């Protein structure tokens, strides 16, 4: 009757799996993404509570037989932030073990099924996290949508808008993004981007969705869009180079995987990223994720149980 909960607090959705102790996933639940750096504490708490309560309703059991909860979330990697998320879950009256980690850590667990390896996330945000054979971890990037997230979908979306505006106002190279962005957002004029960006409650996910427009334009031969994708791939490579160097893995066999809708969806960006790794770190073996991040959280939670 015992079970564990794994929660992926990702940049695109919050995703929960409830699993037996023999790794049979009984059910899953999806809610909107919720990050303490882009939502209020009260709003993040409400998302997490609704997520868990919905799953418990489908399960037909309370938290009493839940042996462990692992949440890997964007936005809460610092010691005080982990306490903030832990308190949100304790607010449900949960009495068991709570493991708070970052979203890269659960992507590593789910993707590689081991403690050692490197993960790059590029979805709404971006980060690189790794752990070497010595068990030491490092991260680069991951500084959020204002002071970081280079090479993320949010960054690509902002850069697409800026390129469209420079095309329109004559500061930059002509690009079909000029009109394609307006068409995607159903806006008549570039002036309408002001109300859209500053006065409509636009979300990070909505901005990141413009990556689709950049990919479509690249496939139509647009040179500015190709450059945006190439530069994003380079930023993601730099995040790997930093972690590899910090962890002393420049000359060592390492397994690397990738998570998020930017790095995993765009053929050209993925290929450029892989080309950088294959040339500079040929002993890095690149694989696809064996399981999703929510299952990685299940692994972390269940592994702490007898
Ligand atoms: C400040 C912030 O929100 N950074 C988040 C990252 O969170 C890290 C763990 C952190 O909080 O330091 C997250 O890994 C990446 C990928 O999803 O997206 C960034 O936007």
UniProtKB/Swiss-Prot annotation:
Localisation: Cytoplasm
Positions that bind ATP: 12, 124, 208
**What lineage does UniProt assign to this protein's organism?**
Bacteria, Bacillati, Bacillota, Clostridia, Eubacteriales
Query: What's the gene?
Result: murK
Q: What is this protein called?
A: N-acetylmuramic acid/N-acetylglucosamine kinase
Top-level taxonomic group: Bacteria
Principal subcellular localisation of the protein: cytoplasm
Q: Which keywords does this chain's UniProt record carry?
A: ATP-binding, Cytoplasm, Kinase, Nucleotide-binding, Transferase
Can you cite an annotated GO cellular component?
Answer: cytoplasm
What organism is the protein native to? Answer: Clostridium acetobutylicum (strain ATCC 824 / DSM 792 / JCM 1419 / IAM 19013 / LMG 5710 / NBRC 13948 / NRRL B-527 / VKM B-1787 / 2291 / W)
Q: Which Gene3D superfamilies match?
A: 3.30.420.40
Which reaction is recorded as catalysed by this protein? N-acetyl-D-glucosamine + ATP = N-acetyl-D-glucosamine 6-phosphate + ADP + H(+); N-acetyl-D-muramate + ATP = N-acetyl-D-muramate 6-phosphate + ADP + H(+)
What is recorded on activity versus pH? Optimum pH is 7.5 to 9.0. Retains half maximal activity at about pH 6.5 and 10.5 and is inactive at pH 5 and below.
Task: Give the enzyme's main class according to its UniProt record, as a single word.
Answer: transferase
Pathway membership: Cell wall biogenesis; peptidoglycan recycling
A Gene Ontology biological process term: carbohydrate phosphorylation
- Function summary: Catalyzes the ATP-dependent phosphorylation of both cell wall (peptidoglycan) amino sugars, N-acetylmuramic acid (MurNAc) and N-acetylglucosamine (GlcNAc), at the 6-hydroxyl group. Neither the non-N-acetylated forms of the cell wall sugars, i.e., glucosamine and/or muramic acid, nor epimeric hexoses or 1,6-anhydro-MurNAc are substrates for the enzyme. May have a role in the rescue of the murein sugars GlcNAc and MurNAc released from muropeptides during cell wall turnover in C.acetobutylicum.
The reply to whether Acetylation figures as a keyword in the UniProt entry is no
Under InterPro entries, the record lists: ATPase_BadF (IPR002731), ATPase_NBD (IPR043129), Euk-type_GlcNAc_Kinase (IPR052519)
